[PDB]
């Protein structure tokens, strides 16, 4: 709900005093790539002529923006380390920036290896220049979470990726979901009503 609402708003509120701009379009262009879907309205972010001219004066979030779709990721992790220094400001803070760097990170890796049926160690090392163990421990933590489909196939040091689709996504989603829902009712539907 945050990006689109922001995205399709323009913002003006009694001389934008709660908007406190030099903040708003930035907040959009680093709230977008969490949930605004990378093909769909990310073009509406980029080729949308309402925001691109006011991030023109804001080159840091600009080079944070066109360093995803242009795959220049040796500057994108640099650009995201900037955001983890201006995470300090906003009072909506702590699991928002830890989760935020988590999902910028995971969306960045999942964007790369999805186009390939096999990902080599040298080309994944080419993403920044981090080498091996950053990708190894980190991606093993991500598949420990199971939120990408890759696996650290060190037998050849080439990462494999097919895609089991989101038919199973639902099942896994709804076990927990269902449980929680019933539990709430289980919290109520006893004598205490």
């Amino acid at each position: 709900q945050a990006a689109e609402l922001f995205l399709d708003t323009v913002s003006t509120f009694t001389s934008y005093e709660l908007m406190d701009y030099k903040t708003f379009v930035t907040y959009t262009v680093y709230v977008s790539m969490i949930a605004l879907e990378r093909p769909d309205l990310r073009e509406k972010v980029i080729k949308g002529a309402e925001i691109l001219e006011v991030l023109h004066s804001l080159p840091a979030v600009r080079q944070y923006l066109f360093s995803l779709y242009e795959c220049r990721y040796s500057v994108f992790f640099q650009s995201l380390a900037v955001v983890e220094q201006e995470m300090k400001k906003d009072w909506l803070f702590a699991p928002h920036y830890r989760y935020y760097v988590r999902e910028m990170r995971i969306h960045a890796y999942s964007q790369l290896l999805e186009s390939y049926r096999s990902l080599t160690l040298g080309y994944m090392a080419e993403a920044f220049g981090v080498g091996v163990e950053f990708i190894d421990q980190e991606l093993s933590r991500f598949i420990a979470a199971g939120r990408l489909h890759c696996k650290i196939d060190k037998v050849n040091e080439i990462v494999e990726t097919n895609r089991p689709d989101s038919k199973n996504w639902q099942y896994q989603e709804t076990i927990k979901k269902g449980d929680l829902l019933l539990n709430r009712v289980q919290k109520l539907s006893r004598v205490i009503n």
Partner: peptide, 26 residues
């Protein structure tokens, strides 16, 4: 918040891991 985060164990984040990453490479 109220969607369960990890926030557990991990040493200083992608700023410092970025820093010793590019410094350890170079």
């Amino acid at each position: 918040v109220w969607e369960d985060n990890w926030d557990d164990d991990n040493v200083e984040d992608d700023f410092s891991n970025q820093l010793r990453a590019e410094l350890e490479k170079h």
